[PDB]
């Protein structure tokens, strides 16, 4: 089994979340869950909740067993950006992109 | 074993048995050709030439195929002078299998 879980429309850019996701890749689920406790980043909380989902996801529905589970594929795709106007000096306007990310985790054995 | 001969305005260092691609001949698909334009024959003793061609040396071969080569694209283009041109080219060939270095 593979057993996917994923946060879609996760409020944080890919480039930031992708920094955390590179820590956990082909690591044992129990070891991965620890790291994100002591990774001082917003995205670590956001990625943890997906992994922690994927494990229960895996154990309830399909595979069972927590000990033999590795994060086989983790990836972050860029989601829809939300456009907002930032007014600047001298009358001109900018467009801030409130970005989002699609975080996926796959917990196989 | 190997011998040298001239065919399609060019020469080939050919051995007995192996296939050779050369320039198109006015010959049927599965007939036979005799080259009496043999330039050299090598063995233990080498029969080289102090004249054009050997003497009684004849390379006998059998025609295998009559295909067309890979499509070469030709692109002419004059920078800034509103001129370019396209042209394909597939050259005709004749594969021949050698069957007698005399």
């Amino acid at each position: 089994m593979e057993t996917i879980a994923k946060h879609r429309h996760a409020r944080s850019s890919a480039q930031k979340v992708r920094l955390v996701a590179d820590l956990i890749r082909g690591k044992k689920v129990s070891q991965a869950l620890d790291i994100l406790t002591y990774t001082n980043k917003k995205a670590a909380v956001l990625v943890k909740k997906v992994l922690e989902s994927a494990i229960a996801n895996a154990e309830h529905n399909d595979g069972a067993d927590i000990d033999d589970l590795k994060v086989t594929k983790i990836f972050v795709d860029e989601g829809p950006s939300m456009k907002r106007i930032m007014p600047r000096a001298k009358g001109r306007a900018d467009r801030i992109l409130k970005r989002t990310s699609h975080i996926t985790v796959v917990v196989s054995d | 074993m190997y011998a040298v001969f001239q065919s399609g305005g060019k020469q080939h260092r050919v051995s007995e048995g192996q296939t050779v691609r050369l320039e198109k001949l006015d010959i049927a698909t599965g007939e036979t050709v005799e080259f009496a334009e043999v330039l050299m024959i090598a063995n233990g003793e080498e029969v080289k030439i102090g004249v054009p061609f050997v003497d009684g040396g004849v390379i006998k071969a059998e025609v295998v195929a009559h295909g067309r080569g890979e499509k070469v694209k030709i692109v002419k283009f004059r920078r800034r002078k509103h001129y370019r041109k396209q042209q394909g080219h597939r050259q005709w060939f004749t594969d021949v299998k050698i069957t007698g270095i005399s």
Binding site: - | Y2, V4, Q6, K10, Q11, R13, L39, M40, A42, E46, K48, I49, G50, V51, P52, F53, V72, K73, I74, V75, K76, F77, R84
Partner: protein, 115 residues
């Protein structure tokens, strides 16, 4: 009769971007950049069919000049020696013989030495 041109244009761009396959950066991705690369490639290809025939002759001539000087004759004198003995064998083969069958090659240098 209005004519939408999305189907045909795509097929035009996709054709060129297929030739640009392998190129670095935008040159493989971006029609506007690729199209230049693909023409330039054509231009260089056209010129290099001319240069291939030159390069190989230099290559052969060097090989022949090397293999001759092992037997004690320079290229210039060797070729005149062969021409004066009415030998019709070309550089392409002399260069092939030079590498493969030196015991044979030696006989051409002797044949040239006569003249």
């Amino acid at each position: 009769a209005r004519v939408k041109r999305g189907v045909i244009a795509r097929a035009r761009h996709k054709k060129i971007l297929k030739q640009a396959k392998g190129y670095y950066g935008a040159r493989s991705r971006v029609y506007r950049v690729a199209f230049q690369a693909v023409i330039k490639a054509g231009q260089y290809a056209y010129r290099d069919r001319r240069q291939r025939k030159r390069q190989f002759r230099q290559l052969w001539i060097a090989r022949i000049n090397a293999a001759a000087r092992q037997n004690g004759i320079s290229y210039s004198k060797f070729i005149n020696g062969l021409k004066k003995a009415s030998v019709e064998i070309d550089r392409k083969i002399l260069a092939d013989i030079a590498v493969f069958d030196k015991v044979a090659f030696t006989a051409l240098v002797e044949k040239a030495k006569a003249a």
